[PDB]
Amino acid sequence: QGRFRGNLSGKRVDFSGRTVISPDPNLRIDEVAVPVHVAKILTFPEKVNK
Amino acid sequence: GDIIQFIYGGDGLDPAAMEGKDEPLEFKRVLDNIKAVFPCPSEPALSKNE
Amino acid sequence: AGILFEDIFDVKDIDPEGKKFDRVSRLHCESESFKMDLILDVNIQIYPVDLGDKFRLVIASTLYEDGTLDDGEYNPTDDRPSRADQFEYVMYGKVYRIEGDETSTEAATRLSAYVSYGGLLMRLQGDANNLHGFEVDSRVYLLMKKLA
Amino acid sequence: DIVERHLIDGDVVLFNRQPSLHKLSIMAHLARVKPHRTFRFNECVCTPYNADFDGDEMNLHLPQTEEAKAEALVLMGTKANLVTPRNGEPLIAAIQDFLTGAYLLTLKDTFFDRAKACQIIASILVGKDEKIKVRLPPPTILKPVTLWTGKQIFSVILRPSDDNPVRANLRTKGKQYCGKGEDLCANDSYVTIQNSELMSGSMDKGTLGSGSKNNIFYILLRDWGQNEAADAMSRLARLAPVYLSNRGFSIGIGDVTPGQGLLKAKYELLNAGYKKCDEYIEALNTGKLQQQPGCTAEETLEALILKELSVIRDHAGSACLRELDKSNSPLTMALCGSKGSFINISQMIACVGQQAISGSRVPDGFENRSLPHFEKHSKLPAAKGFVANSFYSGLTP
Amino acid sequence: APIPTVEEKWRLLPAFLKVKGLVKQHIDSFNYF
Amino acid sequence: KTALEMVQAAGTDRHCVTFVLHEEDHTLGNSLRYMIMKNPEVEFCGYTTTHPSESKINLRIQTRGTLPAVEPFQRGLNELMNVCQHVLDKFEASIKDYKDQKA
Amino acid sequence: GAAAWENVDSTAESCPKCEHPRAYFMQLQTRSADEPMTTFYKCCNAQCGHRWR
Amino acid sequence: MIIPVRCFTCGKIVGNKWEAYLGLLQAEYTEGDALDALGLKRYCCRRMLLAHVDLIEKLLNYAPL
Amino acid sequence: CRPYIIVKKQKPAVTNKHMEELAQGYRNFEDFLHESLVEYLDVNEENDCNIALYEHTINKDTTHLEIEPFTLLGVCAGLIPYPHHNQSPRNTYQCAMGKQAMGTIGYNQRNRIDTLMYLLAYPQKPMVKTKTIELIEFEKLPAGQNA
Amino acid sequence: GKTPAEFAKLNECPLDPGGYFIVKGVEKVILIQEQLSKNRIIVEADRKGA
Amino acid sequence: AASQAVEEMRSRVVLGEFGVRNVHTTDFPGNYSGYDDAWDQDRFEKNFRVDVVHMDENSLEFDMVGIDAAIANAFRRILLAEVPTMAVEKVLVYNNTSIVQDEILAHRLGLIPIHADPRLFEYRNQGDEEGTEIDTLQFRLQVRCTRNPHAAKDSSDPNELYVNHKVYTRHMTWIPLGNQADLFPEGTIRPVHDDILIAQLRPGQEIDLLMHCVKGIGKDHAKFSPVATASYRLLPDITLLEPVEGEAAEELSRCFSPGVIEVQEVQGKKVARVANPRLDTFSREIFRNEKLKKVVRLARVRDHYIFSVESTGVLPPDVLVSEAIKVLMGKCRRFLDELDAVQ
Amino acid sequence: YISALGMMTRISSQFEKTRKVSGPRSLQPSQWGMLCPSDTPEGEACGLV
Amino acid sequence: TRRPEIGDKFSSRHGQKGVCGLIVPQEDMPFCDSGICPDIIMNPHGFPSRMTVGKLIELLAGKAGVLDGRFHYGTAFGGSKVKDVCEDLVRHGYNYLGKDYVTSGITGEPLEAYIYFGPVYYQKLKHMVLDKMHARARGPRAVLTRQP
Ligand SMILES: [Mg+2]
Ligand SMILES: [Zn+2]
Ligand SMILES: [Zn+2]
C-alpha cells in the first residue's frame, strides 16, 4: 500500500460502480444493462453544441 | 531506441489475426469459399497449364 | 420437362448401422435398369418403407411438367396440374456436391451426386452418362412412388 | 456549457472483473438502462470474463472524456475483440444452454410445420432486425405434409434477409465423427455449410463453442466483418432459448440409473479385475513378479493395479454408453459438448475411477495401511483408493 | 447365513450426546478450569 | 399510442408490416397468431417479445400478393371476436342447461 | 518399450484426430476453476504422436 | 413463524385450515387421512401444511405481555 | 478419542437386549463404558486395532465395530441430504453456504438486538431431513423453505 | 439446570448451544487450538536433505 | 398406411417411453395437401361444444371440444392474471403492539380475498390515495387481547387464559362509505372464508388498522388472482392394439388408474378394456412391464380440453370464465378501435 | 443457528498461513471419525480451519 | 422487509449456489395436469459437470414424502432407498421417475420431453444485490493522498 504500488501503479477512481451480474440473452454481445439507480448517480459531462 | 527485432516473429503477422495453425491463411478453405461464393456457370474450366 | 433423372430402385438395407434415429432411416437402394446406387434419408413417420418394397424415383429440375422453369418461390396452397400430383413423396432440395469414384484409380467412369434435403442426405452414384444435366449448387425436386 | 447528464442508452461504458488475467477481462460495451438492479449482458461474453453468475461482483467504469470513450469503443469494442491475442482462438461464442439447444435444433429428427417455424423465425425480429425481410426458406417435404427442418431454421440465422450479402461456407469434422463418413457419417457429425446454408452435420461446441478454430462465427468475423458475426450471434442467442423452452429439456433420476446388462458387465469386470489383482499380489509377495523396466517391483505392482482398475472403469463406461438410449439429457449434453463428458457419465452411472492423489494411489496415513479398516501391508484396490460403486448406488465411507 | 445386525445401533448416538458431544467440550473444560 | 405499424424498410412496402402492440402479453399475441395463421394469403406470421421487463410485443405479417397486411389483421380480429362470442354463448347455454337439469 | 509403454486403460476408442481404435488416455481432476475434468489423448500406432487436450 | 395464508405455488387458501389440521392432529387421524379430509389433492398444499413449523407460540412465550 | 463397540470372537459385545434396555432406560452410555461393551480409542491406539464398518464386513481379525458411519460428517455436512451421492467440492461449498444461510436464530431473536440479523418470513422445516438434523433440533429452527 | 419456561423468563433461547463468553455486549468464542505434541522425538528431513 | 400416420400426427398426441411426439398444432392451410385446413366459421361452430361434468362451489370441470390449444391457453392465462378482483393494498396502522411485523401483517392482509363483486367497482385512477366511494372499500380491524377475568387456576391452554388471542379474519368490520350501505345488503361484503388465522396475540397487545380494498388484476399482483388453480388437460384416449386377456389383464389394471381399465369375464377368462379414460393421469407405468409395452398406445386428443378451475370464493367459476371471455372481447375491441383510429 | 453451532466446534491450525506448504492443508487419514472432511472454509483458510 | 428480486443469491442444500436471473409471471409458467406451477426453474446443465445426483435423490424423496405425508431420511450411507420412493410414486398415481407430462404455459402445447418437478429445500443466503450495489460520484477523498 505504498506510494509506488498503492498510489502510483494502481489507484482508486470515481465515476465507477460495482454490482452483481445476471444473465440476459435478449441483449446484444456489445450491449450491457445498467440499473436506473446507478445510472442516476454516474454522470457524463457533455458540452453544449449546435 | 535499441531494436529488439528487425521484424516481429520474422514475418510481422498479428497473432490475433492468425486464421490457421501458426499460419496466416489456410488456402484450401479460402479456395473453397471463393468457389462457393462466386460460382460462374457461363465460364469454362481450366487445365493445369492454363 | 426438366426431368434430370428417372429410375426404379429396390431397397437392399434399411439401417446398416442400427436405428440411429426415430423419424429418419438410412435407406440403401439399388436400381434395376441401371447400376445406380442410392443412399437416402427420408421421413419414415409420414412415409414408411419396407425392405421388400420397390419405388419409382424421379429427380426433376422443376415441379411443373409443362416446361415452365419459374421456380423462384413455392406456395403450398397453390392448386394446379403439377408433377407432385402424379407422385406420393416429394422432397425439395439442392444438389451441392459432385465427386468422382476413388476406387477405380484408372479408367474411372462412376460419379456420385451429394444432395442435401435439409440435412437429409441423398448420394446417387452411377455412370456419368446417366447423371447428365446434374450441376453443383442446383435446386431440384425428388419424387418417389411405391410400386407393387 | 458543461452539463453532467445521466447515463443513457448508447454511451460507451467499461465493464471489468476484479481478477484480470488477460486483456479481455475488461471490455467496453454499449450502456443500456433497465428498471432492475443488476448488470445484465449477453452470456456469450462470459468466457472472457470467466464469470459464472454465482454471486460474483462486477465493476463498471465510465470515462469522462470523448477521447477515452472513442478509444474504448474502437480498441476495447466487443465486436473487435472476438478473438484472444494468445493463439487467435475465438472466446466470445456459444455457451451452455446454447450449444445443447442448437444441437437439438439441428438434429435430423426435428421437423416443424409452418406456424412453429414462423414463430421460431420471428422470435429474433427485435431491435435492429425489426426492419429486415423474413425470407422464409422453401419447405423440404411438401407432398404428404409441409415441414421445415431445423437446419433451415438455423441457416436462417446466418442469412435472415434477402439483401444480406453474408455467404458463409464451412467444411469440418465434429467431435463424434466416425472417421470414414466424409459427409456420409452415420452419426451425422460432418459440418458442411454452403452460402450461409447448413447442408449437413450437427452443430456442437466444435463448431459453435469457443474451443478452437473452424468456428462458424470465426469464419463470419474473418470473411464478412465484425457486425455480421455480432448480428448472427445475437440472432442465435435470441432464437435458441425460445426453441429450447418450447421443446423441453430435463434430466431425471431415471436418466442416470444403470441397466441390467450394465450391472452384469460391471459385476463381471469387477470380479475379473479383483482376481487379476489378487494374482499380482500373490506373485509379488510369494515368488518372482515381472518387473516393469525403469522402475522397481512395488511400483510395477501399483502401475498394474492402476491399469486394471482403469480398464474396468473404461469398459464399464463403454458398456453404459452402449446401453444408454438416445434423447438422454446427459448423453445429449456429452455429445454436443456443452457441459460434461463421457467420463462424468461413466463415473455417475457405471463406476467411479481410482482416487488418484498426486498421480498415485492413496498413501498410508496410518502405519503400513491407509485406514484401520483394512489389513496391514494390504494393497487391495478398494483398500488403497478404488471406488467400486457409483454415485447413484452410493459411496462407502 | 449372514451375521445378525442390531437394528437400533444408531440409538447409541443420542445417549452419548446427552452427556458429551457438540458443546459439552468447552463447558467441561471451563468447569475443570 | 398502444398499437402502431412499422414498414419493412424505407420503401414503405405494405406487404411486410410489423405491428408493435403495447400493454400486451403472450395471451392475445398467440391467440391472434393462431387466428390469422389460418388465413390462406398469409406467407409469414409471427409474434415475439422485445424484453420481459416492458409489456410490448412485435407481430410481423407478410402476405402472398399485394395485400396491405392490415386487412388480414382486422380479419383475424373480427374472427377472434366471432369465436369469443360463440364460445361465450355456448358456455352460457351449457351452464344454464346443467343448472336446470341439476334440479 | 512399446509393451511397457502400453500400460494404459483406453483401447479401441475413437480419437478426434484420426479416429482409430488405438489410444492412450490421461484423466486429470486437478482443476477447481474449471469444474469438468481434463483429458489428454495419445493416439499412436503408426507413430503419429497425437497430443492435445 | 406463522402459517401463510396462500400456498406459494398454487395460491389456495390454506392457513384457515391450519387450526383444523391441528385439530386433526388431536384426533386419531394420521397425516395422510387428515390431508385427505382437508381436501388437499395437490401435493403443494400438503407440503405447505406439513413442512410448516408453528414458532408463533415460542415467540409469544418471549412476548412482553 | 472416539467410542467403539468391542468385538470379540467375531461377535459384538452389544446385543439387541442391551439396546432394548438402553431404550427403556435400564442403562446409559456410562453403563456400556463400565461393562466393557463400548470403549474409547485414540488415533495411536486405533492405529494398531482393526475396525469394521458393518456387521457383514466383520472378519476373524476384528477388534472393534464402527458405531455409525454417518457420524463421520460434522454438523454442517449433516444438513446435506444423501451426501454420498454428490461431489466433495459440492459438499464443501454447501457447508460454506449453510454457514451463511439466513433463517431463524432462536426463540429470543425478537428481544435480541444485534448489529445485523437476518430472519425468514415463512420458514419451513426440510422434507428430506437427516438424523443429525433431529439430533441438533434444526427442524425447530429452520433456515430455508420448501419450494 | 433451567427449564424452557425459566429460559423464557430470562429472555434466552433453550436451543442456544452456548459456549461463548459475553464481553462489552459482544459474544466471543475461543477457537480450539491445534498444536504439535510436546516431549516427543521428531525425525524429519532437513532443508538441505539431511 | 400413410394416411393413418398423417391422421395420428394431426389429431392425436402420442406419449412415447422417452418423449412426447406430435405436440405441435399443424392443422393450418398449406401444411396438409389432402385436406382443406382453411378456416370455416360454420365447421368450427358445428364441431365445438362445451359439456360440464362437475360444478359445485369453488370448483368447475368442463370439457371443450373443437377449440385449439392457443385459445385454451389464452383463456387460462386471462383467468389466471387478467381477471380483475378486489384486494387490499393500503393499510393504515394505529399502535400495533403485536409481535408480528407490520409489513408482514399488511402482506398477510393483502392475500386475504374479498367477497365483493369486482364488476360493481372500477380501477382507481393514478393518485388520489384517499379513495372515492366508487372505487374503494374500507375494512376496520380492532382486536384487543386481555386476560380472562374468570378461568381455571391452571389454564394450561391459551384458549381459557385469554380472549381474542387469535385474530381471525372474522373480527374485521366493513365500514360503508357514501351509499355503499344501501347498495350492498348486509352480509354480502364480508371475508370469504371467515376462518383465516391472521395472527396470534398475548394479553397487553392490540391490533388496530384500516384496510383500503381496491381493484386490480392478477398480472400486477398474485393477491388479485380469483382462481386458486385454473388449468386444462388433454383428454386421454387409451387404445389397445391387441386384445389383452389372462392375468396380464390384471397387470394392466395395476399399470393405469384403478378407474380407467375394467376387467370382465366374457367366457370365464379375464379380459380388460377401457372404462373411463378421463380418470387416468398418465403415470406411464405401463412402460415398466416389458410384455405390455407393445399392446397399448398412450394418446391425447388434440381438440378435447378438460378445464378444471378452482375459485378462491370471490365469485362462482362460471362467472369467472364469462368475465375472462368478456376481458378478451374488450381487448379485441380496444385493438379494433385503435386500428380504426389509425385509419 | 447452524452458523453458531458450527462455529462453536471450530479448530484452527498452528501455521496460521505463514507459508503455502500444502502439506497440512491436505486431508489426512488421521482425521477419520474425528474431524469433518467435507466441512472447511472456502478460500485461503482451506485446510487450516 | 426485502422481497426476492434479480441478483439475490440462493443456495440449494447441495452447493448449487444460484442467482435470480429472471422473474416470470404465473401465466408464463408451465403447469401440470392438476394445475401445479413450480416456483423456481433450475438449470439442468449444472448436474452433469457437478455430478449432483444427491439433489435428484432428495427431490424424489421429498416428492414421495409430500405425496404420502412422510419425512424420508437422507442419512449419510443410508436413508430411504430409491425403490421405496418409486413404489410410493407408483402407488399415489405419479410417475416412478419424477418426470411428468408437462404442457408449455406460453404456447399452450405439450413439451416434447418430460420435465422433472419436485419439492426441494431452497435456502436464501445473506448475499443480496441490495446491500452490494454501490455507485461512486465525485464524493470525498483521503487526506494524505487525494484519492477516493
Ligand atoms: Mg463464481
Ligand atoms: Zn485413432
Ligand atoms: Zn398449494
Curated annotation (Swiss-Prot), chain A:
Disease connection: Leukodystrophy, hypomyelinating, 7, with or without oligodontia and/or hypogonadotropic hypogonadism: An autosomal recessive neurodegenerative disorder characterized by childhood onset of progressive motor decline manifest as spasticity, ataxia, tremor, and cerebellar signs, as well as mild cognitive regression. Other features may include hypodontia or oligodontia and hypogonadotropic hypogonadism. There is considerable inter- and intrafamilial variability.
Similarity remark: Belongs to the RNA polymerase beta' chain family.
Tissue occurrence: Expressed in the brain, in the cortex and the white matter (at protein level).
Gene (UniProt): POLR3A
Sequence positions that bind DNA template strand: 5, 12, 18
Name this polypeptide is given: DNA-directed RNA polymerase III subunit RPC1
Disulfide bonding pattern of the chain: none
Parent-protein start and end of this portion: 349 to 398 of 1390
Localization per record: Nucleus; Cytoplasm, Cytosol
Organism whose genome encodes this protein: Homo sapiens (Human)
Coiled coil residues, start to end: none
Domain of life: Eukaryota
UniProtKB/Swiss-Prot annotation, chain E:
Localisation: Nucleus; Cytoplasm, Cytosol
Domain of life, source organism: Eukaryota
General function of this protein: Catalytic core component of RNA polymerase III (Pol III), a DNA-dependent RNA polymerase which synthesizes small non-coding RNAs using the four ribonucleoside triphosphates as substrates. Synthesizes 5S rRNA, snRNAs, tRNAs and miRNAs from at least 500 distinct genomic loci. Pol III-mediated transcription cycle proceeds through transcription initiation, transcription elongation and transcription termination stages. During transcription initiation, Pol III is recruited to DNA promoters type I, II or III with the help of general transcription factors and other specific initiation factors.
Record-stated family: Belongs to the RNA polymerase beta chain family.
Disorder this protein is connected to according to its UniProt record: Leukodystrophy, hypomyelinating, 8, with or without oligodontia and/or hypogonadotropic hypogonadism: An autosomal recessive neurodegenerative disorder characterized by early childhood onset of cerebellar ataxia and mild intellectual disabilities associated with diffuse hypomyelination apparent on brain MRI. Variable features include oligodontia and/or hypogonadotropic hypogonadism.
Record's protein name: DNA-directed RNA polymerase III subunit RPC2
UniProt organism field: Homo sapiens
Gene designation: POLR3B
Residues of the full protein shown: 18 to 50 of 1133
Swiss-Prot record, chain F:
GO cellular component, one term: RNA polymerase III complex
Taxonomic source organism: Homo sapiens
Localization per record: Nucleus; Nucleus, Nucleolus
Encoding gene, per UniProt annotation: POLR1D
Function description: DNA-dependent RNA polymerase catalyzes the transcription of DNA into RNA using the four ribonucleoside triphosphates as substrates. Common component of RNA polymerases I and III which synthesize ribosomal RNA precursors and short non-coding RNAs including 5S rRNA, snRNAs, tRNAs and miRNAs, respectively.
Subunit structure: Component of the RNA polymerase I and RNA polymerase III complexes consisting of at least 13 and 17 subunits, respectively. Pol I complex consists of a ten-subunit catalytic core composed of POLR1A/RPA1, POLR1B/RPA2, POLR1C/RPAC1, POLR1D/RPAC2, POLR1H/RPA12, POLR2E/RPABC1, POLR2F/RPABC2, POLR2H/RPABC3, POLR2K/RPABC4 and POLR2L/RPABC5; a mobile stalk subunit POLR1F/RPA43 protruding from the core and additional subunits homologous to general transcription factors POLR1E/RPA49 and POLR1G/RPA34.
UniProt record similarity statement: Belongs to the archaeal Rpo11/eukaryotic RPB11/RPC19 RNA polymerase subunit family.
Major subcellular location class: nucleus
Position of the signal peptide: none
Superkingdom in the source lineage: Eukaryota
A GO MF term: DNA-directed RNA polymerase activity
Name of the featured protein: DNA-directed RNA polymerases I and III subunit RPAC2
Keyword Ion transport (UniProt): no
Disulphide-bonded residues: none
Gene Ontology biological process terms from the UniProt entry: transcription by RNA polymerase III; transcription elongation by RNA polymerase I
Keywords, alphabetical: Acetylation, Disease variant, DNA-directed RNA polymerase, Nucleus, Transcription
From Swiss-Prot, chain I:
Residues involved in RNA binding: 100
Section of the entire sequence shown: 593 to 739 of 1133
Subunit and interaction comment: Component of the RNA polymerase III (Pol III) complex consisting of 17 subunits: a ten-subunit catalytic core composed of POLR3A/RPC1, POLR3B/RPC2, POLR1C/RPAC1, POLR1D/RPAC2, POLR3K/RPC10, POLR2E/RPABC1, POLR2F/RPABC2, POLR2H/RPABC3, POLR2K/RPABC4 and POLR2L/RPABC5; a mobile stalk composed of two subunits POLR3H/RPC8 and CRCP/RPC9, protruding from the core and functioning primarily in transcription initiation; and additional subunits homologous to general transcription factors of the RNA polymerase II machinery, POLR3C/RPC3-POLR3F/RPC6-POLR3G/RPC7 heterotrimer required for transcription initiation and POLR3D/RPC4-POLR3E/RPC5 heterodimer involved in both transcription initiation and termination.
Family: Belongs to the RNA polymerase beta chain family.
Name listed for the protein in its UniProt record: DNA-directed RNA polymerase III subunit RPC2
Organism encoding this protein: Homo sapiens (Human)
Disease linked to the protein: Leukodystrophy, hypomyelinating, 8, with or without oligodontia and/or hypogonadotropic hypogonadism: An autosomal recessive neurodegenerative disorder characterized by early childhood onset of cerebellar ataxia and mild intellectual disabilities associated with diffuse hypomyelination apparent on brain MRI. Variable features include oligodontia and/or hypogonadotropic hypogonadism.
Localization per Swiss-Prot or TrEMBL: Nucleus; Cytoplasm, Cytosol
